[PDB]
Write a protein that binds this ligand. Structure first.
Ligand SMILES: *CC(=O)c1ccccc1
Length: 230
């Protein structure tokens, strides 16, 4: 019996498009009048951050603020502009003003809460996860918010999932996890017997469909699956 439904953050609740728009305005405010194409700075920022997150996958937690400030200090020295000491604050402000939820998030979160435990499991520092849920107005729709900072390990380490299930007081077999990253999400949640639901909004992850238990393009399909199984 499924009694809990857990969600990832980026790509599941808040749109990658909104994050890309926010990230661009972040690099813009960092550069100001500096003669560096903010688009080139962003592409290089995403390349370095992808490499960093890959090195830390499944490993002990390190503050994301430190990891990202390290990347931007390297980019500042590379291109010659002043490292903004308030980079973290700028990222928070812009993320909150231009971040947006997918059109069906609130509807889905409401239909689930009350019937099942509704939780989030995210690779991010707890401060930023809470501030972003608040800026998007959906913090009160979750019964639990579980972060790599709390568990001490990044996904797909099982501890972050273990902690989520413990907060809800359910077994893995009684829980669903929804996300768009086949390895960190389906693989990490499958270790505990959770039902994995892959979210492929644009149908770009067909090569990983055969490993996750279910695949959906819209979160409104999650409620259907939970009913089919119960
Ligand atoms: C990249 C991005 O959106 C971000 C980075 C650090 C803190 C908050 C948001």
């Amino acid at each position: 019996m499924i009694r809990a439904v857990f969600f990832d953050s980026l790509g599941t609740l808040n749109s990658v498009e909104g994050a890309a728009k926010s990230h661009l305005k972040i690099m813009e405010e960092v550069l100001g009048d500096y003669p560096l194409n903010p688009k080139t700075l962003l592409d290089e920022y995403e390349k370095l951050t992808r490499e960093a997150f890959s090195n830390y996958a499944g490993k002990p937690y390190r503050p994301l603020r430190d990891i990202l400030e390290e990347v931007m200090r390297k980019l500042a020295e590379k291109y010659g502009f002043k490292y903004p000491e308030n980079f973290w604050e700028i990222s928070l402000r812009m993320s909150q003003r231009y971040g947006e939820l997918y059109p069906e998030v609130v509807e889905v979160l409401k239909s689930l809460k009350g019937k099942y435990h509704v939780g989030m499991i995210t690779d991010s520092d707890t401060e930023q996860a809470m501030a972003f849920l608040d800026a998007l107005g959906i913090k009160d729709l979750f019964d639990s918010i579980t972060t790599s900072e709390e568990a001490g390990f990044f996904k797909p380490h099982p501890r972050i999932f273990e902690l989520a299930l413990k907060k809800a007081g359910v077994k893995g077999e009684e829980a669903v996890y929804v996300g768009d990253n086949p390895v960190k999400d389906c693989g990490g949640s499958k270790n505990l017997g959770m039902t994995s639901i892959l979210l492929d909004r644009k149908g770009e992850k067909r090569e990983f469909w055969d490993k996750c238990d279910f695949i959906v393009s819209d979160l409104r399909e999650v409620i259907k699956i939970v009913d089919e199984l119960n």
